[PDB]
Design a protein around this ligand. Sequence first.
Ligand code: HEM
Ligand code: HEM
Lengths: 145, 145
Amino acid sequence: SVYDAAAQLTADVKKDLRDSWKVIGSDKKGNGVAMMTTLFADNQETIGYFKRLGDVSQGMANDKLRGHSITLMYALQNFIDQLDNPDDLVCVVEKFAVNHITRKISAAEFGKINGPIKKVLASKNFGDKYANAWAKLVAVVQAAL
Amino acid sequence: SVYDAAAQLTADVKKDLRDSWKVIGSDKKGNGVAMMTTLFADNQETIGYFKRLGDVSQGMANDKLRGHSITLMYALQNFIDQLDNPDDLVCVVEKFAVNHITRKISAAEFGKINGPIKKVLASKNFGDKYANAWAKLVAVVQAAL
Ligand code: HEM
Ligand code: HEM
């Protein structure tokens, strides 16, 4: 249940999400592309889904990948801004869930983003505590897939 | 080209866009839904395109419409944040252009959003000068359709 999952976002989890987002959200282009390239490097089997983006190995030089990556960060910004109201968080989560359901992305495969997030956070000196907080937010989307 | 349309946006236009966005972008849920409901009220012929959202006459109560409306405002937030780097603005614009090209939305049809934007701006006392500024930003997307 997406609603039960959303209920897991306690006061402490919400603060950790906001505190870490202040840092990684300040450079959407840089961190967005970093998240994507890490996903492709650590999980080669997912590259097939991103056929439209072309040669993703080009990274920042790939205009489609850069546009996609920046936009992905605004999806996260959206989630963060909705933390105060669970009903609004749920409706935006289900909107993006549909974007992935149509792409045939399962909850299990969506969860492969946790690795990349953990690594990007770690590069900015945010440890497991923060990685786990983000895993709970990702879990809300997983519940809708 | 899209780059040409983007590179054209002058300092004064960007100033008006950012000044007005500070206000209408401060209540994404409220103004986003207002924009969509106005589009449906003034251009009833577009309702059919949004059948995935269900009964759009439900307004704020429609969770799918609310989720869509909030997300649409983040696309605009994205545009506004990229104003000073045409290269980044172009790649995000082309990303969203694809979202509409796949739905068979022509440049002319996409321009129907200007009416609703003008009205929402006016509700906050931003006159024609501001509506014209926004029409220029919308024109950047039209250059990609
Ligand atoms: C934090 C997690 C993630 C977020 C916030 C997210 C967000 C997004 C957004 C906003 C889009 C664009 C939707 C559209 O315009 O159609 C997108 C597209 C896509 N996402 Fe994700 N995504 C995430 C994780 C993943 C993962 C882990 C996979 C794959 C294993 C995935 C696969 C896709 C695919 C295939 C597309 C379509 C790309 C295209 O052809 O343009 N996403 N995602
Ligand atoms: C300020 C201008 C506009 C912006 C920034 C915008 C933004 C968006 C965004 C972000 C999406 C979601 C893309 C996806 O997840 O697939 C969307 C979907 C859509 N847009 Fe727009 N849009 C605008 C104007 C229009 C206009 C004027 C029309 C039609 C005359 C239109 C028709 C559509 C349709 C049919 C969808 C699909 C809705 C669905 O089934 O979920 N858009 N738009």
